[PDB]
């Protein structure tokens, strides 16, 4: 089936311009369909931004009409969004979608991308520190602490490069009084394995381009 | 939003539930209605199109209706599978755009009570050679999502510097989680005999304790 | 502005994708992903009347569901495709015809038979065999090539005229 994958910067300083790109696979940008952008503010309902058709026709939401531009690139199978003069009210998850088929109508949003998150703020993009939560009766627990970082949402944690995936739990972040986030990730493992295994957490924060591997071991 | 929905609905397992969406002559009056379902943390999914038709893979429990400027969604044989957000959508001839309702959180009654697990980690040795001290309390797997977190140096309360999360989002009768962080100087760490994280959940209290040189 | 809905069917590898893109975009594609199924729209002029063509290109794999039968039923006429150098692709024509009537509740349906890849010298299906089969089914027969664009417009336009004698 068609596949849609959006990309963009996770943080924007006002009054800059937001830019996003959606890449299409498993189908042609030149089929009889309409390509849409939709957003969801955190904890609120959905809003529709606009449409494009492969021959350059467009409709825009009347409330945004003066700030929005959408475009198609035939040569790469993509379409994109620009939104000028951003302010804090524009913080949302953004989705790209396809629908309104001329063959058999199912509605406006038959296929969806996985979405991407954009934060609009004046603050500055600090990268995290990372510390080990060392383990201390059939099982034990151990983890990694991710501390004092800004731009909350494009952050990822995995263990042993993906080779360990059972018993992994990652909690929500907390916004501290300083305005900087913290995060924790923890895994539980058979207590005999502590003498004959290696556990490594891999944090990846893209807005600061931070990559860190920390090995966690018994105190 | 331009269409109006009630903020919430609920029912016991096996009974029938109904959701409504109201609009105006320029939209729900003139055009078709579409319904979408969303599970927390994922993109929406189509559920009913053109008033009352089901796409492939939607059970027979879901049916839809339109009457005048109003629409309705009915669900029968309610199950935990169904705890989700629901949205109506339509086109509007006065605006030339798609408009959405507000959303409606459905909740399944009669889920049983489950009590929290608590895990507490002391400061790592690195944070103490960089002049910092954070205590981490990790709280997991309780069902009723309302938890209070108190900290207690020795025996007297210590409510300065305590950060705590909101409850999580919830779906498919999944359990909740939360976490809390207490910040100290390195000297305050060595100067006290003990610290506790204390979690109260409907009177039932759970307490964990750590000490320097543990 | 009447509208017409056309479907292209035939065995894997016979040239369904290449024929459609020739009509829509006027260029040839040496190979194309055999899983992709798509629909296209174009405005054309046939005998003076302007009209829109919708074209469904079929792909994927063999599956029978109650939704696919609705996706196909929507079509008003069908193009059966075989390749002149592939004998097995010519026998399959019977299977495709019977499935089409199973979802259209009728014996009379507009169809045209297409023999593709006429630019290749190694024929294994002669031209007489194809005319005898077409005369039995009561439908026209057309030879095409999608590497030179010989016969492409003719094939599609013949189908449209079929759909008009019906009504
Ligand atoms: C190389 C992949 C490819 O091109 N395929 C196209 C042909 N597919 C296929 N194979 C065998 N039978 C069918 C039947 C149908 C069909 C028809 C003709 C009418 C109605 C109907 N309802 N459901 C299915 C069908 C189709 C569309 C494709 C067939 C193999 C893949
Ligand atoms: N020589 C020649 N090759 C063709 C012609 N049409 C298609 N082909 C080739 O046949 C192969 C299969 O065609 P394709 O469009 O992918 O068939 P599909 O499986 O029905 O989508 C491709 O490699 C094309 O290059 C033609 O008219 N002449
Ligand atoms: Mg093909």
- CATH for B66: 2.60.40.10
Backbone angles phi, psi at B83, to 5 degrees: -70, 105
Q: Can you give the length of chain C in residues? A: 167
B140 touches B42 (CB < 8 A)? no
Between CA C159 and CA B184 the distance in angstroms is 81
Contact yes or no for C125/C134 (Cβ under 8 A): no
Which of B87, B121, B213, B211 lies closest to A216, judged by CA? Answer: B121
Cα dihedral A167, A168, A174, A180, rounded to 10, equals 150
Q: How many domains does chain B have?
A: 2
**Rounded-to-5 percentages of helix, strand, coil across chain C:** 35, 25, 40
Q: What angle do CA B65, B68, B73 make, to 5 degrees?
A: 25
Q: Which residue has the tokens 């809003």?
A: A47
Read off the DSSP letter of residue B111.
Answer: P
- Beta-carbon separation of B214 and A136 below 8 A: yes
β C2-10/C49-57 pair status: parallel
Is residue C26 within 8 angstroms of chain B, CB to CB? no
CA distance A193 to A216: 13
Residue B1 lies in a domain: no
User: Distances in Å between the alpha carbon of A2 and those of A7, A30, A98?
Assistant: 17, 13, 9
**Least Cα separation, residue C78 to chain B (angstroms):** 25
Instruction: List all residues 6 or more positions away from A144 whose beta carbon is below 8 Å from its beta carbon.
Output: A130, A131, A132, A133, A157, A184, A185, A201, A203, A214, A216
Phi then psi for residue A7, to 5 deg, are: -145, 155
DSSP string computed for A50-91: EEE-TTS-EEE-TTTTTTEEEEEETTTTEEEEEE-S--GGG-
- H-helix or E-strand containing B48? strand B45-48
Q: Is B157 exposed, middle or buried, given 0-12, 13-18 or 19+ CB atoms closer than 10 A?
A: exposed
Same domain? For B103 and B146 the reply is no
Q: Does residue B161 sit within a domain?
A: yes
Does an H or E element contain A213, and which? strand A210-216
- Phi, psi dihedrals of residue B188, rounded to the nearest 5°: -60, -30
If asked whether residues B130 and B90 sit together in one domain, one would say no
Strand, helix or coil for residue B130: coil
3-state secondary structure of A34: strand
Q: Which residues contact B162 (CB under 8 A, 6 or more apart)?
A: B149, B151, B180, B181, B182
Instruction: Judge whether B157 lies within some domain.
Output: yes
In chain B, alpha helices (H): 125-129, 186-190
d(CA B8, CA B18): 11
- Using alpha carbons only, give the angle B48, C60, C82 rounded to the nearest 5 degrees: 130
3-state helix, strand, coil in chain A (%, to 5): 5, 50, 45
Task: Name the helix (H) or strand (E) containing A99.
Answer: strand A92-99
Chain B hits for C67, Cβ within 8 Å:
55-56
Specify the CATH class of A3-120 in words: mainly beta
Experiment type:
cryo-EM
Question: For residue B64, what is the enclosing H or E element?
Answer: strand B62-67
User: C7 CA distance to ligand 1 centroid (A)?
Assistant: 11
Tokens 């620009």 — which residue?
A82
For residue A175, the SS3 value is strand
Collect all residues of chain B within an 8 Å Cβ-Cβ radius of residue C70.
Answer: none
Kindly state whether residue B3 falls inside one of the protein's structural domains: no
Both B65 and B136 in one domain: the answer is no
CA dist C68 and A65 (Å) reads: 39
Domain boundary among B108, B132, B166: B108
Question: Does residue B64 contact residue B48 with C-beta atoms inside 8 Å?
Answer: yes
Buried/exposed A97-115: b ≥16 CB within 10 Å, e otherwise: bbbbbbbeebbbbbbbbeb
Q: B204 vs chain C: nearest CA distance in angstroms?
A: 53
One domain for residues B127 and B182: yes
User: Of the candidates B77, B108, B139, which is a domain's last residue?
Assistant: B108
Distance CA A12, CA A120 (A): 5
User: What Å resolution does this PDB entry report?
Assistant: 2.8
Query: CA A170, CA A176: separation in Å to the nearest integer?
Result: 18
Annotate B94-123 with b (16+ C-beta within 10 A) or e (fewer).
eeebbbbbbbbbbebeeeeeeebebbbbbb
Q: How far apart are CA B103 and CA B85, in angstroms?
A: 6
Ligand 1 lined by C73 (C-beta under 6 Å) = no
Query: How many whole angstroms separate alpha carbon B140 and alpha carbon B87?
Result: 31
d(CA A132, CA B156): 29
CA–CA dist B57, A54 (Å, integer): 30
Strands C77-83 and B133-142: unpaired
- The DSSP letter of residue B4 is B
Q: How many CA atoms lie within 13 A of A66 on its CB side?
A: 2
Domain boundary (B108, B133, B150) is at B108
The SS3 assignment for C64 reads coil
Task: Give me C46's structure tokens.
Answer: 């046939």
DSSP letter string, A66-77 = TTEEEEEETTTT
CATH number of the domain within which C125 lies: 3.40.50.300
CB-based contacts of C115: which residues, under 8 Å, 6+ apart? C82, C83, C84, C125, C130, C141, C142, C143, C144
- Please check whether residue A104 touches C, CB under 8 A: yes
Question: Each residue of C39-65: b (16+ CB within 10 Å) or e?
Answer: bbbeeeeeeeeeeebbbbbeeeeeeee
The strand order across the sheet containing B162-164 reads: B117-121, B133-142, B176-184, B162-164
- Give the position of tokens 């995936």: A165
Alpha-carbon gap, residue A11 to A16, rounded angstroms: 11
**Superfamily for the A129-216 domain:** Immunoglobulins (2.60.40.10)
Among candidate residues B2, B4, B22, B102, the one with its CA nearest the CA of residue B68: B22
Q: For residue B56, which residues of chain C lie inside 8 Å, CB to CB?
A: 65, 67
CA distances from A82 to A10, A42, A70 (A): 14, 20, 7
- B99 and B147 housed in the same domain: no
Q: Are B55 and B97 contained in the same domain? A: yes
Q: Residue C80, class by beta-carbon neighbours within 10 Å (0-12 exposed, 13-18 middle, 19+ buried)?
A: buried
Angle between the C16-25 and C152-166 helix axes, to the nearest 10 degrees?
A: 90
The answer to whether C129 faces chain A, any CB pair under 8 Å, is no
Q: Which among C25, C35, C39 has the least Cβ separation from residue A101?
A: C39
Q: How many angstroms separate the CA atoms of C113 and B174, rounded? A: 57
From C36, C78, C99, C100, mutation site for ligand 1 pocket: most ligand atoms within 8 A of C-beta: C99
| Domain span including residue C111 | 5-163
Domain coordinates of chain A in residue numbers? 3-120, 129-216
Rounded CA-CA distance B66/B21 in Å is 10
Total domain count for chain C?
Answer: 1
H or E segment and range at residue A185 = strand A181-190
- Reported in sequence order, the residue ranges of chain C that DSSP labels E, i.e. its strands, are 2-10, 38-46, 49-57, 77-83, 111-116, 141-143
Q: How far apart are CA B62 and CA B26, in angstroms?
A: 27
Q: State both tokens at A17.
A: 């311009």
C-alpha angle C2/C6/C10, rounded to 5°? Answer: 175
CA separation for the pair C87, C65 (Å, rounded) = 29
Q: What is residue C155's DSSP assignment?
A: H
Count of Cβ atoms closer than 10 Å to residue A127 Cβ:
17
Q: Are B120 and B108 in contact (CB under 8 A)?
A: no
Question: If phi over 0 gives left and psi between -120 and 50 gives alpha, with beta otherwise, what is residue C155?
Answer: alpha
Among candidate residues B35, B71, B40, B38, the one with its CA nearest the CA of residue B53 = B35
B156: domain range? 117-210
Q: How many Cβ atoms are within 10 Å of B179's Cβ, its own excluded?
A: 22
Coil, strand, or helix at residue C46?
A: strand
Whether the Cβ atoms of residue B38 and residue B44 lie closer than 8 Å to each other? yes
- What is the per-residue burial (b if ≥16 Cβ within 10 Å, else e) of A53-65? ebeeeebbbeeee
Q: Which of A37, A44, A33, A4 is nearest to A18 (CA)?
A: A37
Domains A3-120 and A129-216 share a fold: yes
Cβ contacts of A129 within 8 Å, gap of 6 or more: A146, A147, A148, A149
């Amino acid at each position: 089936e068609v596949q849609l994958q959006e990309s963009g910067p996770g943080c924007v300083k006002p009054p800059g311009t937001l830019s996003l790109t959606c890449a299409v696979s498993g189908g042609s940008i030149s089929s009889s369909n309409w390509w849409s952008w939709v957003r969801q503010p955190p904890g609120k309902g959905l809003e529709w931004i606009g449409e494009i058709y492969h021959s350059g026709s467009t409709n825009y939401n009347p409330s945004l009409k003066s700030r929005v531009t959408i475009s198609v690139d035939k040569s790469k199978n993509q379409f994109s969004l620009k939104l000028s003069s951003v302010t804090a009210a524009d913080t949302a998850v953004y989705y790209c979608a396809r629908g309104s088929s001329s063959w058999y109508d199912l509605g406006p949003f038959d296929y969806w991308g996985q979405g991407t998150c954009v934060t609009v703020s004046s603050a500055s993009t600090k990268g995290p520190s990372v510390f080990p939560l060392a383990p201390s009766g059939g099982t034990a627990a151990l983890g990694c602490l991710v501390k004092d970082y800004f731009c909350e949402c494009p952050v990822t944690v995995s263990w042993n490069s993906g080779a360990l995936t059972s018993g992994v739990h990652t909690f929500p972040a907390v916004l501290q009084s300083s305005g900087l986030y913290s995060l924790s990730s923890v895994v539980t493992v058979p207590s005999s394995s502590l003498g004959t295994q290696t556990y490594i957490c891999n944090v990846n924060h893209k807005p600061s381009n931070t990559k860190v591997d920390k090995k966690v071991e018994p105190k | 939003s331009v269409l109006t929905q009630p903020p919430s609905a609920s029912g016991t397992p096996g009974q029938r539930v109904t959701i409504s969406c109201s609009g105006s002559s320029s939209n729900i009056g003139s055009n078709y209605v579409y319904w979408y379902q969303q599970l927390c943390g994922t993109a929406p999914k189509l559920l009913i199109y053109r008033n009352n038709q089901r796409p492939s893979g939607v059970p027979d429990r879901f049916s839809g209706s339109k009457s005048g400027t109003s629409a309705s969604l009915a669900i029968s044989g309610l199950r935990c599978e169904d705890e989700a957000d629901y949205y109506c959508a339509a086109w509007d001839e006065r605006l030339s755009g798609w408009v959405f309702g507000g959303g409606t959180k459905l909740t399944v009654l009669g889920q049983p009570k489950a009590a929290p697990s608590v895990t507490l980690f002391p400061p790592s040795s690195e944070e103490l050679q960089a002049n910092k001290a954070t205590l981490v309390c990790l709280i997991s797997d309780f069902y009723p999502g309302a938890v209070t977190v108190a900290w207690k140096a020795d025996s007297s309360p210590v409510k300065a510097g305590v950060e705590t999360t909101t409850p999580s989002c919830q779906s498919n009768c999944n359990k909740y989680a939360a976490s809390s962080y207490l910040s100290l100087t390195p000297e305050q760490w060595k100067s006290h005999r003990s610290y506790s994280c204390q979690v109260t959940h409907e009177g039932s209290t759970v307490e964990k304790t750590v000490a320097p040189t543990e | 502005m009447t509208e017409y809905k056309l479907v292209v069917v035939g065995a894997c590898g016979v040239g369904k994708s290449a024929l459609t893109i020739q009509l829509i975009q006027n260029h040839f594609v040496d190979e194309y992903d055999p899983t992709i199924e798509d629909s296209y729209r174009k405005q054309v002029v046939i005998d003076g009347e302007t009209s829109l063509l919708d074209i469904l290109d079929t792909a994927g794999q063999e599956e029978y569901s109650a939704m696919r039968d609705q996706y196909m039923r929507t079509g008003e006429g069908f193009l059966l495709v075989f390749a002149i150098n592939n004998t097995k692709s010519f026998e399959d024509i019977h299977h495709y015809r019977e499935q089409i009537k199973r979802v259209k509740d009728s014996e009379d349906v507009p169809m045209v038979l297409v023999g593709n890849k006429s630019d290749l010298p190694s024929r294994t299906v002669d031209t007489k065999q194809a005319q005898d089969l077409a005369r039995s089914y009561g439908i026209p027969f057309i030879e095409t090539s999608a590497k030179t664009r010989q016969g492409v417009d003719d094939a599609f336009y013949t189908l449209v005229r079929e759909i008009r004698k019906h009504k």
